[PDB]
Amino acid sequence: DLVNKKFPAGDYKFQYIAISQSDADSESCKMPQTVEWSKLISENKKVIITGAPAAFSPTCTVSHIPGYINYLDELVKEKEVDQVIVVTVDNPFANQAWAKSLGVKDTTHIKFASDPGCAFTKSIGFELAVGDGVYWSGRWAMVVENGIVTYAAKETNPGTDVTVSSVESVLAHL
């Protein structure tokens, strides 16, 4: 179990596309950036990570990620969260469009991360097997404080449940 141990970043990386306030007002041409998990955690004292099976999937879109966007200002201003990372295996363009469709205007404190091949998510055992060697992320949440995992939980039944992975559960451990 990951709780009270060092964040196992290893050499794992993710891709995301930035969003700034200038966008959705002006025309922009942003490209994927590669972020080493190790650098994100060493540069940021307080990091929330949440896993989502699929960009644009209804349970994630309706019942899970909106809460993180709704509480984002509170997490940053009141609870001193530096980064909220939404992790899927989806391509970074699809993730960025999903973030914008959900009202994300600024990726300074929230980033929608692509975990290609589900490599990082499988490494921590939080994957969802979807058949014939294909893995999506399960639905999960994690809190990392000064590079140490203080909270880690995966949904047993990601088809129905947003419980231990909800922003509300995360707020309770901050």
Binding site: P58, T59, T61, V62, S63, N157, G159, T160
Partner: protein, 104 residues
């Protein structure tokens, strides 16, 4: 009055009650139309007591939804002797009511 089927075995047992009309509302918790038809189905259940009414969360019992080829919610499927007679797609009260009335 509308009984949630929470497993395949429950669904199979419900369809095996036999002879009289069995209605199953295939719904999703994230689905607005599902949440709107739900009280409507409860009131149809109180009215047409000669039929047995059930609901099934397509995300909880996905194998049953997929075999029933539910691609849209709501879908009410109407069964007699464990076999489908008709189905109504969408939050369509009058269409659902007519489907019950002529199959009960």
């Amino acid at each position: 009055m509308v009984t949630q089927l929470k497993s395949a075995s429950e669904y199979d047992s419900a369809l095996a009650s036999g002879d009289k009309l069995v209605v199953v509302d295939f719904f999703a918790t994230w689905c607005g139309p599902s949440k709107m038809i739900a009280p409507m189905i409860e009131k149809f259940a109180e009215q047409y007591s000669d039929a047995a009414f059930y609901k099934l969360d397509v995300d909880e019992v996905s194998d049953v939804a997929q075999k029933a080829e539910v691609s849209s919610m709501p879908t009410l499927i109407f069964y007699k002797g464990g076999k489908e007679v008709t189905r109504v797609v969408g939050a369509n009260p009058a269409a659902i009511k007519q489907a019950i009335a002529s199959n009960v």
